[PDB]
């Protein structure tokens, strides 16, 4: 139902501060699922969403071993990556990860994903296909060869389909009550003038994904693109100025998933 998402991993090399810290977070749509931190008081992974607490210790004890495993493969991988570039161990670097699947309205497998990151942006990402990788460095090739040897892509593809997806639908049916809501955003219309010679926003919506089109004219200068923002509860929130007598022909068009009609 145009609703499916991802798992996030973060590992930070500390400024000679011992061992990296590791953050395992998960998500279904814009609704987060699991919370692991290595300097947390709990060496288990915590559920912050209530509808994953319908899962038993069979699911928790079997997912707290795996995240520790991820922390270890991270804590070793950074030692490798910084070990084979040009760094000093007093240095502090960062590694962020990605793997996962999306699904269409028939809840059937939409294409899945899997990407890595060094200090910079893109390091290695699973391409929009099955067996392949996208690398653009030099070390990237040696490690992607290392994944061409281990036959990683297909053994991860067997998880992207049939393990991420049925668990995704399982989550969509065990939290069906909290994902029935396509919360429509409510609008007003305000004005403020400073010189003698406005605002396009949305306030309460469940998927963050909203286009806010601001007559037959295109723009390049006037609007300041702002990022979509969390309202701290599972809702999200999201200007242009013109001569004081000519702010009266334009309208703001909005398309949202919970909006059957684009708004004038």
């Amino acid at each position: 139902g145009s609703h499916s998402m991802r798992y996030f991993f973060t590992s930070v090399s500390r400024p000679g501060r011992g061992e990296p810290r590791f953050i395992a977070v998960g998500y279904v749509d814009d609704t987060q699922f699991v919370r692991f931190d290595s300097d947390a008081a709990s060496q288990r992974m915590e559920p912050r969403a209530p509808w994953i607490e319908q899962e038993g210790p069979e699911y928790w004890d079997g997912e707290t071993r795996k995240v520790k495993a991820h922390s270890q493969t991270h804590r070793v991988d950074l030692g490798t990556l910084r070990g084979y570039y040009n760094q000093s161990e007093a240095g502090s670097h960062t590694v962020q990860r990605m793997y996962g699947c999306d699904v269409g309205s028939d809840w059937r497998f939409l294409r899945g994903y899997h990407q890595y990151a060094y200090d910079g942006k893109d390091y290695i990402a699973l391409k929009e296909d099955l067996r392949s990788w996208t690398a653009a460095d030099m070390a990237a090739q040696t490690t992607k060869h290392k994944w061409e040897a281990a036959h990683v892509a297909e053994q991860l593809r067997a998880y992207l389909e049939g393990t991420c997806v049925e668990w995704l639908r399982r989550y969509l049916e065990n939290g069906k009550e909290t994902l029935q809501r396509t919360d429509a955003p409510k609008t007003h219309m305000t004005h403020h003038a400073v010189s003698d010679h406005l605002r396009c926003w949305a306030l309460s919506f469940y998927p963050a994904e909203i286009t806010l089109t601001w007559d037959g004219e295109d723009q390049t200068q006037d609007t300041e693109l702002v990022e979509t923002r969390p309202a701290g509860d599972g809702t999200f929130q999201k200007a242009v100025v013109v001569p004081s007598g000519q702010e009266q022909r334009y309208t703001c068009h909005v398309q949202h998933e919970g909006l059957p009609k684009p708004l004038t």
Partner: peptide, 9 residues
Amino acid sequence: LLFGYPVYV
């Protein structure tokens, strides 16, 4: 739910 084989770079 989680990916179960130890991936290393």
